[PDB]
Amino acid sequence: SVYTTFMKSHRCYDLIPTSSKLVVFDTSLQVKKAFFALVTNGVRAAPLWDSKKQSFVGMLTITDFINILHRYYKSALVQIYELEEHKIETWREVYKPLVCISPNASLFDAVSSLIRNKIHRLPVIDPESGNTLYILTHKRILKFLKLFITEFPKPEFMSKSLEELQIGTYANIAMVRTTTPVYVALGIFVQHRVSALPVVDEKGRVVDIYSKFDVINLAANLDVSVTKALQHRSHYFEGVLKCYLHETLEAIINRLVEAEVHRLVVVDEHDVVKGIVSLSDILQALVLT
Amino acid sequence: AKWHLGIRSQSRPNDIMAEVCRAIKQLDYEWKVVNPYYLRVRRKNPVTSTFSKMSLQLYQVDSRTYLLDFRSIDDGGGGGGGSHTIEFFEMCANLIKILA
Amino acid sequence: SPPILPPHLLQVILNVMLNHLYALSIKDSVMVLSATHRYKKKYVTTLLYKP
Numbered sequence: 001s002v003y004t005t006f007m008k009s010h011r012c013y014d015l016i017p018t019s020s021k022l023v024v025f026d027t028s029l030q031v032k033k034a035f036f037a038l039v040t041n042g043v044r045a046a047p048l049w050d051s052k053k054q055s056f057v058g059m060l061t062i063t064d065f066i067n068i069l070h071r072y073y074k075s076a077l078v079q080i081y082e083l084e085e086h087k088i089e090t091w092r093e094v095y096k097p098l099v100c101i102s103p104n105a106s107l108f109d110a111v112s113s114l115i116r117n118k119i120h121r122l123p124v125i126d127p128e129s130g131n132t133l134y135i136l137t138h139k140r141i142l143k144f145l146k147l148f149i150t151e152f153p154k155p156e157f158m159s160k161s162l163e164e165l166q167i168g169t170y171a172n173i174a175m176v177r178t179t180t181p182v183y184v185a186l187g188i189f190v191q192h193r194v195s196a197l198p199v200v201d202e203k204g205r206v207v208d209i210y211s212k213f214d215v216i217n218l219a220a221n222l223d224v225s226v227t228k229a230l231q232h233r234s235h236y237f238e239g240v241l242k243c244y245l246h247e248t249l250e251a252i253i254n255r256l257v258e259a260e261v262h263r264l265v266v267v268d269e270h271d272v273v274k275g276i277v278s279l280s281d282i283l284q285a286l287v288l289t
Numbered sequence: 290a291k292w293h294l295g296i297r298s299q300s301r302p303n304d305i306m307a308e309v310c311r312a313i314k315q316l317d318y319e320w321k322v323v324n325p326y327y328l329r330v331r332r333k334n335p336v337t338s339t340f341s342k343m344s345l346q347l348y349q350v351d352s353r354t355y356l357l358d359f360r361s362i363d364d365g366g367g368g369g370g371g372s373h374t375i376e377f378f379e380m381c382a383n384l385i386k387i388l389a
Numbered sequence: 390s391p392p393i394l395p396p397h398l399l400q401v402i403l404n405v406m407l408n409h410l411y412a413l414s415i416k417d418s419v420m421v422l423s424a425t426h427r428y429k430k431k432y433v434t435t436l437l438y439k440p
């Protein structure tokens with residue numbers, strides 16, 4: 001496949017922006033300052049540095065912040081308030097080896113690494129200097145593939161509809177209602193290990209979307225409704241980006257890249273959610289052709 | 290956020306270079322005096338056994354104020370499974386600590 | 390007497406400087422250090438949060 005050949009012939013280095021910022025936490029850092037540093041810097045993940053061992057040992061991402069908030073909320077109900085002054089190392093102890101990639105590794109290896117390990121963050125680490133150079137994402141990769149692959153030769157499957165390809169998830173879709181408390185959302189996130197939740201109504205029609213990303217805004221209150229929390233919507237919002245089963249892989253990939261979101265909600269004529277199509281599904285389907 | 294370059298002092302330039310040699314000697318780093326106001330300092334990582342190098346340069350920014358500048362040297366240093374960059378930060382942090 | 394600061398070597402940054410150490414005013418016993426480095430033609434500014 002053209003995608004497969006392109007991925008194998010390009011290095012991870014080629015994906016790195018000319019200029020970027022990286023946020024690193026010493027594992028002795030207190031968890032509460034760690035998550036305030038993510039927000040302030042507008043970053044979604046941070047490599048962890050163990051000073052005693054003199055090396056990176058893991059990642060701190062929004063998923064962890066959510067695990068910790070959820071734990072904090074429950075514990076509080078039982079008068080346990082320890083997560084506050086917790087160091088990162090101590091909270092890691094309470095409970096996933098570092099997975100990284102060399103800038104000289106192929107794009108194919110990067111993609112396989114994300115899928116196999118079920119992660120969303122892949123630090124590019126130079127084996128020579130030992131420095132983390134950049135954190136690779138599904139989003140960055142797909143955009144790059146779309147930009148740098150010629151439209152033709154075009155694989156036949158790119159013209160196939162979602163219906164035919166069966167890419168994405170179409171059963172047991174974790175969803176919340178507009179009247180759903182933020183703390184209930186956290187529990188669903190933690191249980192289902194899913195990057196976002198469609199917000200539906202009485203009849204099951206999607207009207208909004210609640211992402212793991214929309215949660216960290218809260219480290220800069222867990223009682224408010226999902227709807228109410230999605231009013232501090234920092235970015236201009238045109239409504240929920242969706243797709244239909246009749247649509248081609250090509251149109252869906254184009255929509256994803258242009259909108260720069262991690263997933264579309266598959267929906268029927270009535271805006272009723274039928275499934276989810278995520279960059280995770282897309283990249284996987286492309287790496288297995 | 291407000292970022293500051295290196296560290297400032299209002300002591301005499303000679304006095305400043307004195308304190309930094311002492312801070313260096315305390316951490317047990319190696320150092321070479323290029324200029325009276327320019328030092329290269331080397332250090333072997335206790336864990337990774339690799340070496341890291343950096344420059345210490347004193348500048349005058351005021352009539353009464355001086356600025357000690359830290360620069361990492363890209364000499365193929367660090368990389369022991371460590372990080373040249375992070376290890377640079379730690380050498381500096383330690384020095385800045387001993388001062389103050 | 391020491392050399393005068395080079396004009397492009399900025400003393401303060403608000404939100405040739407390559408490899409130079411920058412830092413925030415210490416607060417809460419946490420130190421934040423920063424610097425921009427180069428890997429071939431790619432530049433990254435690393436911030437380290439250290440107690």
Ligand SMILES: Nc1ncnc2c1ncn2[C@@H]1O[C@H](COP(=O)(O)O)[C@@H](O)[C@H]1O
Nearest residue numbers: 059061063096097098099119120121122
């Ligand atoms: N590159 C990585 N290496 C090791 N662990 C990771 C990596 N990326 C994410 N994780 C962890 O895996 C879990 C899922 O994170 P995420 O993929 O960001 O939703 C979180 O607990 C992360 O801390």
Ligand SMILES: Nc1ncnc2c1ncn2[C@@H]1O[C@H](COP(=O)(O)O)[C@@H](O)[C@H]1O
Nearest residue numbers: 168169173174194195196197276278280
């Ligand atoms: N709200 C959801 N409910 C059920 N499955 C989902 C949901 N969101 C994503 N998935 C699936 O979980 C896998 C990882 O997607 P993501 O969490 O978006 O990286 C993909 O196969 C998605 O189709």
Ligand SMILES: Nc1ncnc2c1ncn2[C@@H]1O[C@H](COP(=O)(O)O)[C@@H](O)[C@H]1O
Nearest residue numbers: 209211213239240241261262263264265
């Ligand atoms: N399918 C979608 N439709 C509309 N907005 C979305 C969609 N997916 C994510 N977002 C928003 O885009 C931002 C980035 O989320 P993510 O795509 O998870 O990185 C979040 O604020 C989401 O609420």
